[PDB]
Design an enzyme around this catalytic site. Structure first.
Site, PDB file in Angstrom:
ATOM      1  N   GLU A 190     105.542 -93.492  36.698  1.00  0.00           N
ATOM      2  CA  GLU A 190     104.817 -92.337  36.265  1.00  0.00           C
ATOM      3  C   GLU A 190     103.325 -92.501  36.734  1.00  0.00           C
ATOM      4  O   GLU A 190     102.482 -91.512  36.835  1.00  0.00           O
ATOM      5  CB  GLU A 190     104.767 -92.131  34.761  1.00  0.00           C
ATOM      6  CG  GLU A 190     106.434 -91.535  34.342  1.00  0.00           C
ATOM      7  CD  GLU A 190     106.980 -90.521  35.327  1.00  0.00           C
ATOM      8  OE1 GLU A 190     106.338 -89.495  35.510  1.00  0.00           O
ATOM      9  OE2 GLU A 190     108.023 -90.794  35.807  1.00  0.00           O
ATOM     10  N   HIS A 220     115.276 -72.673  33.003  1.00  0.00           N
ATOM     11  CA  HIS A 220     114.850 -73.077  34.315  1.00  0.00           C
ATOM     12  C   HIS A 220     113.932 -71.854  35.017  1.00  0.00           C
ATOM     13  O   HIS A 220     113.458 -72.238  36.088  1.00  0.00           O
ATOM     14  CB  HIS A 220     115.802 -73.698  35.233  1.00  0.00           C
ATOM     15  CG  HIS A 220     116.171 -74.914  34.672  1.00  0.00           C
ATOM     16  ND1 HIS A 220     116.018 -76.219  35.312  1.00  0.00           N
ATOM     17  CD2 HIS A 220     117.263 -75.224  33.667  1.00  0.00           C
ATOM     18  CE1 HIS A 220     116.488 -77.090  34.550  1.00  0.00           C
ATOM     19  NE2 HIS A 220     117.381 -76.539  33.524  1.00  0.00           N
TER      20      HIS A 220
END
EC number: 3.4.17.23
Lengths: 174, 596, 48
Positions: free
Chosen positions: B357, B487
């Site tokens: 990350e 989505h």
């Protein structure tokens, strides 16, 4: 609290009176002795400024600052005190009061004053009081939110030289 | 002057104004999660009103650049993105229609719901009990009527002002704010260049077919053994070619056999090397997970949560008058000091997410810390599965055994071998298909090819056949529930996972044994490999001149996804798989069926 | 010199000093030497 700017560099003439007057960093002329160096008379280049650009406070720089406001000469030599001013000048309301210029019209040498403050167009626009379409102002404000890290956050910016000057100094011993 | 110089004075002020203003928006959001008000809604009141305005008027006020004479990628893409506009794309009346669309059920989509009339006694909250059933649910008529129930009520609670938004924007979508539904996207994967630089269109898709069309036996007996378990718990009837509903195990998910895991724990008799029990044998905890697990997972040196932030951070889900959730939240400012804050519960998975990350930010910086609008990514399938993918990639079993978790119990003796070994295999495999066809529909859904007119008969027959696949009552086109996808609402595509997962297998492969680790071919390595770091800077990721091949890859890895060391892993699979899943048959013959 | 600027360029300053005095004092003795040759021929002629 406030400082005479890079153009307003002030004769706080810190000299010529009897000598009855914080991490260190070292670049320039022979540091490790105190009395012999020449501090003669001082116009003061001193302001609370960003800390990120301490590499651009060095010989041979290129970037936004170097191109359009100020660059430092390739002969900048000195050992100074590189230390932060977080607890002092890390504000919480948002501080635009410190003003930094965006572009410079003439290639200048250090150590003088330029106060061109007319309503300054940086583009082709004949700015007849209506901003936009490439319209600007000479000086631009900063903006300081409750969390500015060491980059825009000012060190108490002693990133200076002990510059070599002309007159007799004022520091000695017995 | 040029695009760089005009946009550069523009960005010296525009990084400031957009960054700073959405920054005030973020700080205002944080002050909100301190305390709740309407002032706090657009400020979180003045700032969200100001920011939505700000971006649309930024469009309106710097919408002044052409495209035609461009032969270079960054200028071309930058200038198309710039000419992309808000509140100002097309003509007057249709865009006023559009803005009321967007804002109006941008509000009402959250505000909409209803109740039930069946028994005149009550209609109140429903969440917790069915979530306990989600965690322990294996029941029959529950499955059936629950899918029927929920994918029947969602319909007319979405349809009124999403009728306006998605539906009315949907007839214009049959004229979709672009051209429409087919080739004008079947003409984009060939990137705008010629003869030497840009992409192809078929290699990944063909190897995906070659993979799945014979991965199917993995479905066969993996789902056969979790079918023995799933039909000793689930409904009523056994043969090979059946029919099941899905939705409420209490609610949606019921996804994986790794989700059916809790009946089938990792290690039975000896305590698993499992973070709770084995890392309490190793003296490790939860507030200690934050601090002592900077130590306990990321002894490599997690970035410090900033000091005043640590002081002010009431870190958990507050449970007081403050109604916040530290479901991973991130803060990042920049401004010539490299600063990053995140909500993260650092496990070993979270090790991998700390590492990449920062790495996912490294991607972001590659499209979010280059020169302000020269901040462009690699490809469109590369945005949040970038975190998920190379978390799963950064999985490094015996590297973290050098950190101390996995023993070398990777053995073969029938029953508990089945369990342990095929359970890691269970995870490493997973499944493709309806995600596949939906994403294919999206790509083949941008120029125009969709029939509309002869509504009742064509849509009825089309609808029956197109749905086809069983649900207790249809969740479906003509009785228009289906277009509620998160989505599509928030735009988190799944082919993202796919392309990065291809990247995953190769580059991971050379990541945990080949920088010269101890053991097998799975096991990939980077141990003491600053040299790996530079050859990441070095031989895939720079652009599309000589590509994604050229400035990380052809040293960290190579192109496609494979299963070869996983085949040394997975040959027991295919043999056992063949041998007994005869109680599941290819396609559907409609005669034999468990679930029918 | 030695107080402020070291001999990276004080070694070249002493190098240029020693070589410049090589020419200038080898030529001190060199034109003084051709002068000695002339004066010696003169002394020989004078004695004769």
């Amino acid at each position: 609290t406030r400082f005479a700017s890079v153009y307003a560099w002030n004769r706080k003439r810190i000299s010529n009176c009897v000598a009855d007057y914080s991490t260190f960093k070292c670049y320039g002329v022979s540091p490790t002795k105190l009395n012999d160096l020449c501090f003669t008379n001082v116009y003061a280049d001193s302001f609370v400024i960003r800390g990120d650009e301490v590499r651009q406070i060095a010989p041979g720089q290129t970037g936004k600052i170097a191109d359009y406001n100020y660059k430092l000469p390739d002969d900048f030599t000195g050992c100074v005190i590189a230390w932060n001013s977080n607890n002092l000048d890390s504000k919480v309301g948002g501080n635009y009061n410190y003003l930094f210029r965006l572009f410079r019209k003439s290639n200048l040498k250090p150590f003088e004053r330029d106060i061109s403050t007319e309503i300054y167009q940086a583009g082709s626009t004949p700015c007849n009081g209506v901003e936009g379409f490439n319209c600007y102002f000479p000086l631009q404000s900063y903006g300081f939110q409750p969390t500015n890290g060491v980059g825009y956050q000012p060190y108490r910016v002693v990133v200076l030289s002990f510059e070599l000057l002309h007159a007799p100094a004022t520091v000695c011993g017995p | 002057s040029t695009t760089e110089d005009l946009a550069k004075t523009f960005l010296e002020k525009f990084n400031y104004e957009a960054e700073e203003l959405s920054y005030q928006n973020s700080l205002a959001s944080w002050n909100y999660n301190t305390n709740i008000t309407d002032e706090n809604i657009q400020k979180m009141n003045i700032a969200g009103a100001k920011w939505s305005a700000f971006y649309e008027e930024e469009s309106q006020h710097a919408k002044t650049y052409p495209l035609e004479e461009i032969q270079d990628p960054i200028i071309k893409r930058q200038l198309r993105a710039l000419q992309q506009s808000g509140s100002s794309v097309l003509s007057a009346d249709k865009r006023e229609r559009l803005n009321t669309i967007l804002n109006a059920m941008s509000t009402i989509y959250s505000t909409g719901k209803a109740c039930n009339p069946n028994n005149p006694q009550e209609c109140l909250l429903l969440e917790p009990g069915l979530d306990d059933i989600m965690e322990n649910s294996k029941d029959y008529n529950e499955r059936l009527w629950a899918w029927e129930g929920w994918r029947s009520e969602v319909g007319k609670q979405l349809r009124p002002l999403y009728e306006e938004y998605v539906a009315l924007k949907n007839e214009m979508a049959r004229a979709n704010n672009y051209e429409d539904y087919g080739d004008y996207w079947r003409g984009d994967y060939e990137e705008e260049w010629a003869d030497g630089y840009n992409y192809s269109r078929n290699q990944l898709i063909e190897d995906v077919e070659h993979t799945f069309t014979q991965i199917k036996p993995l479905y066969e007996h993996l789902h056969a053994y979790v079918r023995a378990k799933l039909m000793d718990a689930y409904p009523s009837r056994i043969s090979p070619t059946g029919c099941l509903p899905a939705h409420l195990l209490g609610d949606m998910w019921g996804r994986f056999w790794t989700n059916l895991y809790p009946l089938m724990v990792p290690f039975g008799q000896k305590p698993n090397i499992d973070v709770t029990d084995a890392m309490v044998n190793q003296s490790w905890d939860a507030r200690r997970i934050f601090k002592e697990a900077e130590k306990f997972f990321v002894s490599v040196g997690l970035p410090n949560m900033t000091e005043g932030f640590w002081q002010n951070s009431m870190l958990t889900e507050p449970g007081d008058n403050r109604k916040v959730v530290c479901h991973p939240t991130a803060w990042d400012l920049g401004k010539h000091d490299f600063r990053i804050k995140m909500c993260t519960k650092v496990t070993m998975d979270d090790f991998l997410t700390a590492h990449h990350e920062m790495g996912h930010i490294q991607y972001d910086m590659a499209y979010a810390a280059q020169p302000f609008l020269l901040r462009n990514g690699a490809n469109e399938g590369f945005h949040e599965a970038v975190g998920e993918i190379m978390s799963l990639s950064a999985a490094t079993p015996n590297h973290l055994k050098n950190i101390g978790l996995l023993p070398p119990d990777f053995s073969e003796d029938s029953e508990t071998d089945i369990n342990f070994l095929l359970k890691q295999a269970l995870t490493i495999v997973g499944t493709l298909p309806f995600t596949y066809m939906l994403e294919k529909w999206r790509w083949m859904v941008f120029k125009g090819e969709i029939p509309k007119e002869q509504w009742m008969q064509k849509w009825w027959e089309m609808k029956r056949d197109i749905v086809g696949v069983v649900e207790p009552l249809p969740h479906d086109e003509t009785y228009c529930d289906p277009a509620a996808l998160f989505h599509v609402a928030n735009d988190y595509s799944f082919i993202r996972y796919y392309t990065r997962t291809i990247y995953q297998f190769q580059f991971q492969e050379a990541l945990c044994q080949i920088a010269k680790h101890e053991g097998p071919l799975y096991k990939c390595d980077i141990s003491n490999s600053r040299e790996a770091g530079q050859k990441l800077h070095e031989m895939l990721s720079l652009g599309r001149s000589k590509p994604w091949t050229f400035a990380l890859e052809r040293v960290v890895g190579a192109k496609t996804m494979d299963v070869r060391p996983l085949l040394n892993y997975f040959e027991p699979l295919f043999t056992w798989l063949k041998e007994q899943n005869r109680n599941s048959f290819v396609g559907w013959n409609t005669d034999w069926s468990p679930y029918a | 010199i030695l107080s402020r600027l070291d001999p990276p360029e004080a070694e070249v300053q002493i190098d240029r000093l020693i070589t410049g005095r090589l020419q200038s004092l080898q030529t001190y003795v060199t034109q003084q030497l051709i002068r000695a040759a002339e004066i010696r021929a003169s002394a020989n002629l004078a004695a004769t």
